[PDB]
Amino acid sequence: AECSVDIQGNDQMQFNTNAITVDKSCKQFTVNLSHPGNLPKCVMGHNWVLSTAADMQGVVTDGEASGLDKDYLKPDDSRVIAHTKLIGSGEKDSVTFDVSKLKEGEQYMFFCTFPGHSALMKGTLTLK
Ligand SMILES: [Cu+2]
Numbered sequence: 001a002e003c004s005v006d007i008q009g010n011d012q013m014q015f016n017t018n019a020i021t022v023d024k025s026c027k028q029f030t031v032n033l034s035h036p037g038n039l040p041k042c043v044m045g046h047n048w049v050l051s052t053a054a055d056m057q058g059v060v061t062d063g064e065a066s067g068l069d070k071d072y073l074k075p076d077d078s079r080v081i082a083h084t085k086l087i088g089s090g091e092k093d094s095v096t097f098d099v100s101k102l103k104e105g106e107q108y109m110f111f112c113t114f115p116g117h118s119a120l121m122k123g124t125l126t127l128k
Contacts, residue, residue, distance in 0.1 A: 001023060001025065002023065003022070003023060003025075003026035003027075003028065003029045003030060003099075004029070004030040004031070004032065005017075005020060005030070005031055005032070006032045006034065007031060007032070007033050007034070007048065008033070008034055008035070008036055009033065009034075009035055009046035009112060009121060010035070010036045010037050011036070011037030011038060011039045011044050011089070012037075013044065013116075013117055013120055013121060014120060014121060015112070015121050015122075015123060017123065018122070018123035018124070019123050019124045019125075019126075020110065020123065020124070020125040020126070021125075021126055021128055022099055022102065022125065022126065022127045022128065023128055024104070024127070024128045026099050027099055027100060028096050028097065028098055028099055029096065029097055029099050030094060030095070030096040030097075031048055031082075031084070031094065031095055031096075031110075032092065032093075032094040033046070033047070033048045033084050033087065033092060033093050033094065033095075034087075034091070034092040035087050035088065035089050035090060035091055035092070036089075037089045038089055039088075039089050040088050040089060041068075041086065041087065041088030041089075041091075042068065042088075044088075044089065044114075045068075045072075045086045045087060045088050045114050046086065046087060046112045046114055046117065046121065047071055047072065047073070047083060047084050047085060047086040047087065047093075047112055047113060047114065048082075048083065048084045048093075048095065048110055048111075048112065049063070049073065049080060049082075049083045049084075049110060049111055049112070049113050050080070050081040050082040050083065050097065050108055050109075050110045050125060051079050051080055051081055051108065051109060052079075052081075052106070052108055052109070053107065053108065053109045055079040056109050056111065056118070056122070058079060059073075059074070059077065059079050059080060059113065060111070060113050060118045062074040062077065063077075063113035064113065064115045068086070071083075071085050071086035071113075072086055072113040072114050072115065073086075073113055081097060081101070081102075081108070082095050082097035083095060086113075086114060099127060102127040103127065104127045104128070105126065105127065106126070106127065107124045107125070107126045108124065108125040108126065109122055109123070109124060109125065110122070110123055110124075110125050111123070
């Protein structure tokens with residue numbers, strides 16, 4: 001029925017949800033990210049990245065190393081299934097991905113690659 005969901009990353013380094021469920025009927029899925037708080041992109045920026053759980057660490061490691069002008073994401077990274085832009089306070093961004101590529105029942109992981117956030121800003125994403 002509904003293939004979208006609005007998520008938030010506040011100035012406390014946290015997402016307002018830690019688990020997403022994609023409905024079996026959804027052929028594509030949308031996540032609209034927004035940033036409540038007062039802090040700037042260089043201090044408390046967030047993004048939304050999807051990858052398999054096993055790929056997370058690498059994606060972060062290389063992400064952080066990728067630097068800011070790169071939305072803390074290795075450019076052209078094959079491990080990234082989907083991702084938004086790194087956004088600062090008072091901003092928003094959205095991404096819509098191809099569900100047919102997802103493996104039903106596989107618990108994927110989504111998270112922010114901004115330095116030091118992933119440990120606390122991560123969660124599951126499962127296709128029902
Ligand atoms: Cu973050």
